[PDB]
Every structure is written in C-alpha cells, then in structure tokens.
Amino acid sequence: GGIAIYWGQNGNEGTLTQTCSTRKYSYVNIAFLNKFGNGQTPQINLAGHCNPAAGGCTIVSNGIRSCQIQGIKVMLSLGGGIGSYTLASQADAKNVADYLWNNFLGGKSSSRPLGDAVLDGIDFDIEHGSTLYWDDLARYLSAYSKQGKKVYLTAAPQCPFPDRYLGTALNTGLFDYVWVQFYNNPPCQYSSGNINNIINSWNRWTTSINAGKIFLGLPAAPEAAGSGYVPPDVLISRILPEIKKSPKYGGVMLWSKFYDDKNGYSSSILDSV
C-alpha cells in the first residue's frame, strides 16, 4: 500500500510541491477548511503557508498540479481539531457541497482560494460539532461525479467504532478511502507492550464498513498527538504483518508532514507499508 499525509498546518513543513516530490506519499490531504456552515463564509486555514486574502493562496495550485502529474491524489480536508465548522440543516449540507464544487472541484468561481487546479476529492475530518447531515454532504458531493470527473470521498474517523460524527456517512458506502485515527483514544490505540487494542479495533473497522481501502492512521512523532505514538520498529515488526493481511488494507496515514520531517517516520517505514 501507500502513505497518506496531512499537509498545511505548519508553514515550516515545506511547499506542497516539495512534499509531493519526496516520493514518499501517495495521497495528500490539505488541512484545513476549518470554518463553514451555519451561514459562515468558509475560510481555509493553512497556518503560515499563505494568507488566502487577495488570492494569496492560489500559488498552491502549482503544488496541486505537480502532485497530480506524479499520480498523487490531493484532497481538501474539512474540519480538524479546531474550528467552528458545523452543518445546521440539510439545506446547509447542500449549500456547502455547492460551495466546494465551485471553489475547489470542477465548478466555477471567481474567487477559488487555492487557484485554478481541480482537487481530486474531499476529506472529512469532523471531530466535534454537529453529528448530523454529514451523510447528506457526502451524497451531494458524490452526485457531482455524474458530470464526468470523479469526486473522491475520504474520511478520518477516530478509532472508537462506530464514530459519533462520521458513522452514518460511512454507512452510505460512498467513501473511497478511510484513514482511521488510532491515537488520542486509549481504548483503541497502541500502549506500551500492548498491541491488542489496536489490532482488535482494526478488525472491527475492516469488517464493518464498505469503503474501498482502509488505512492505519498514526502520529508521525510523539509530539504530534496527546497519546498513541508507535515506534517504527514496533509498527514494522508487530503491527504491519497483522494488518496487511486484510484485503481492505490500503496503507498508513500520518499526522502530519511537519512532524514526519522532524522524526523521519515515513523514511523508516516506507518499504514495509
């Protein structure tokens, strides 16, 4: 399989072009569109990379194209750990889907925040707020595929199954790739000496949902998460041989590009994935 990486939350982590040029990643999620819904004007947050005012982030289209040329799929990630994103109603789901289509996908807008490039899909990283309507948002985005170009749908649920925010949306069977977050959640993450909780949880996920491929999501450094970091050696020796047995195995997801650079996590695990 391949490695999915989150990029966008630390201005020092390198450009999107450099990120794709590493040749380590197969998927890149751009983190985050962290404000939308409830009549708010949607706002992308790419930390120090660029300021989206006055088309300050359109330069990112260069990186998007460069990734895609090399066969890397690039998603815009909604939500994240911080932000006032929500969906107020089913009409809000529709408004948000139309906004995303016109501003990031195959539609038209005079003010596309990341420029002219057409993203491959949308990543759902919904971690708080409303548990409602995410399934409608997935349906509406999925309908836009009928115009000719596939809109990929991906999700980052937390490991406790089922996920309170994304469970219904994942039950739709519309998601292409699901990278489960096996961290910040004691009952289903790695803890010193104990791999049972994580394998047990992986078995639940892979047997329970219909998506194309399921990925094992991890923090790339001890600093990247509150808890759940797994040393690469343990991953390679004890965890991967077990999880790679699943036909639904897609590879590994890492939070985030910035920490990966510092800790050299993907460099250490790349050939084992």
From Swiss-Prot:
Q: Provide the GH18 domain boundaries.
A: 1-273
**Gene3D superfamilies xrefs:** Glycosidases
Q: Name one GO cellular component term.
A: extracellular region
Enzyme Commission code: 3.2.1.14, 3.2.1.17
Q: Which GO terms describe its biological process?
A: chitin catabolic process; polysaccharide catabolic process
Enumerate the subcellular locations listed in this protein's record, separating them with semicolons.
Vacuole
Q: Which family does it belong to?
A: Belongs to the glycosyl hydrolase 18 family. Chitinase class II subfamily.
Extra notes? Two components of hevamine have been isolated: hevamine A (shown here), the most abundant, and hevamine B.
Function statement? Bifunctional enzyme with lysozyme / chitinase activity. May have a role in plugging the latex vessel and cessation of latex flow.
Q: What's the protein here called? A: Hevamine-A
Q: Which organism is it from?
A: Hevea brasiliensis (Para rubber tree)
